[PDB]
C-alpha cells in the first residue's frame, strides 16, 4: 500500500495539475473532499472507486467535535493503505494549506513504514492573488486562521496584506458548529481596530468553483464585517493600513541611505 | 448533460474562449435547457445544483 | 485579440493546471519567461509558436533599466493582442507571484478594451508546504522579500512560520554591491537575533524543477546562514521561536476560557 | 532525454516505476550510459550537454 495526497484546486476539472490528475486516474482507491456535486461527478468519471470523506462531518443532528471528524477521515485513508491499496486523497485547493488531514495521514503512513507524499495544489490564496491582480511576493503577505487569531496572541504587520481564513466560524470555540454570530465578529473587529481603522476597506473573497461563475470580490468597511453574509468558503483580505518606514538601524549597517531606495 | 458541459468548459480552453464570446449560443450547442441557461445567466448557483 | 497569462508551476510538465496547458496548446502565439532548457523544449513541443521574452533582458553587460526591459516585454505581448492573436504568456510557477510583466500586460490589455486574465499556478510557496509537510494555518504564516524585511520595519510574529524570499540577494543594492553575500547575511542574522536565538534551526529550501531531482531542504542553525551557498531560487524558512499563548483579553470578551476550547 | 523527462514529470505510473528502479526504467526508455550516469550522479550541468 501507499498514500499520495493531491489538491484539485478551486475551479471544476481544470485547476488540478496534470500529474495530480494522473495519480487520481491510476489510484486503486480515492478518498475525496470536494466543493460540490459537479466536482464529485467529475472525480467519479476519472476513477469510479471513490470514498467521499464528507460522510465523516457531523450529519443528521449529531454533536461532533471537528477533531474527531479529522481523526476518522485519517483512519479511513490509513485503513485502505494498510489493506495494500495504492491510495490517493483528493482534497479541494492545496491539500496541505489550512488542511490537517493530508499532513496527518502522511505522518501516520510513514510511521507505519508506508510510502507517502503530498503533491502541491492551487489554494484559495493562489486564486485570490490572480483575481485581485496582486503580486504578494514583492508586497509580502500573512495568513492566520480567524479563530486562532482571536483565541491566541498573534500580531499582524499592518503594512502587509493580511488574510484571515475560515472567517465564517471566527470565534466559534466548541468546533461543533459550522457558523459564528455577529457578536463574535464585532469582537474580532474591535481586536483588529488596534492596527486597522473602523472605516478601513476590507475584501470578502470567494474564488469561483464553477467555470460559469464570477468570484465574490466584496469591498466593505471593516465596521460592517459583523453584518456581512459569510460562507464556509469565505476568506477575509485586509489590505495594508500603515505606510512602510525605513529600517534606519539595518540600512546604517548595510551602509545604504533612504534616498537610495 | 449540465455536469458534462461544466466539466468540459472547466478544462477545455477553446470551449472556455468560445463561451466568453457567446455564452448562450455555446450552452445551446451543448444541449442546455432555457431553464439551465437562465440559472447560469442570473448566476443562481443553488438552482443549477437543482437542475 | 485576447490575453491569458498562465503559470507552469515549478516541476517540468506535470505541475501546470489542465486548463493552463489547454490555453498554451490552443494559443495563436505564446510569450515565454521559462528557465531551464527542458522547460523551454517542453513548451515549444506543446505549441511551436513561442517568442522568448528572455531576449529583452540586458545582454553583453549593457546597462539596461529593469523598468525598460519589462516595458519592452509588455509592448511585445500587446503587439500580438493588438494584431488579433489569441495570446498566451507562459510564466514559471504562479504568473502573478514575483512577476510584474503579467500584471502590467493584463492592465494594459484591459485598458485597450481586450479580454485579459491571469490563471493561478503552483508557486514555490505551494511546493514548500508540501515538501516540508508544514501547514501555514498551523500557527499562522508571514512572507516577506528578504531585502524588504531588511530595508523596512517588519517585526515578525515569532509564533508563525516566517518565510524570507530571495534570501540569496538579501540587502543587495547598487550602494551595497561591493559588500559580499556573507557580510549582508551576517547583518540579517543580527536583525533576526532580536526574536530568534542564534542556535534557532532554520531551513534553506529550493523546490525541484526536474522529476529526477529532489528539493533542497537544508536544516542549519541561524548563526551558520552567512556561510551557506545560496541560489536565486533559495528561500529561508524560520519556524516559530514561541509556542501559541492564550489571548485572555479576547477570551474574556467571548465570555470563555482555555478549558472551553474544543 | 527531453521526451523522457516530460513523460516522467506528467505520468504518475512512470514516476512510480522510475522510483522503484531508475536505471532499469531509463534503459527501457532508451537513455544513453552517459545520460543515465549524469541522472544517477545529479550532474545537472552534464545533462545540459546531452539534451
Ligand atoms: C479547511 S480550509 C481549506 C483550504 C484549501 N486547502 C485551500 O487550498 O484553499 C477552508 C478555508 O479555505 C478558504 N477557502 C476555501 N474555499 C475558498 C474559496 N472558494 N474562496 C475563498 N476562500 C476559500 C476559506 O478561508 C475557508 O474557510
UniProtKB/TrEMBL annotation, chain C:
CDD domains xrefs: OphMA_like
Zinc is among the record's keywords: yes
Residues the entry annotates as binding S-adenosyl-L-methionine: 94, 124, 166, 207, 232, 235
Protein name: TP-methylase family protein
Pfam families: TP_methylase (PF00590)
Residues involved in S-adenosyl-L-homocysteine binding: 94, 124, 166, 207, 232, 234-235
Coiled-coil portions: none
SUPFAM superfamilies for the chain: Tetrapyrrole methylase (SSF53790)
Keywords of the record: Metal-binding, S-adenosyl-L-methionine, Zinc
A GO molecular-function annotation: metal ion binding
Domain Tetrapyrrole methylase: 3-213
Xref: InterPro entries: 4pyrrol_Mease, 4pyrrol_Methylase_sf, 4pyrrole_Mease_sub1
Keyword set includes Zinc: yes
Species of origin: Shewanella oneidensis (strain ATCC 700550 / JCM 31522 / CIP 106686 / LMG 19005 / NCIMB 14063 / MR-1)
UniProt-annotated binding residues for Zn(2+): 125, 141
From TrEMBL, chain D:
Domain of life: Bacteria
Organism: Shewanella oneidensis (strain ATCC 700550 / JCM 31522 / CIP 106686 / LMG 19005 / NCIMB 14063 / MR-1)
Domain Extradiol ring-cleavage dioxygenase LigAB LigA subunit: 2-50
Protein name (Swiss-Prot/TrEMBL): Extradiol ring-cleavage dioxygenase LigAB LigA subunit domain-containing protein
Membrane-crossing segments per the record: none
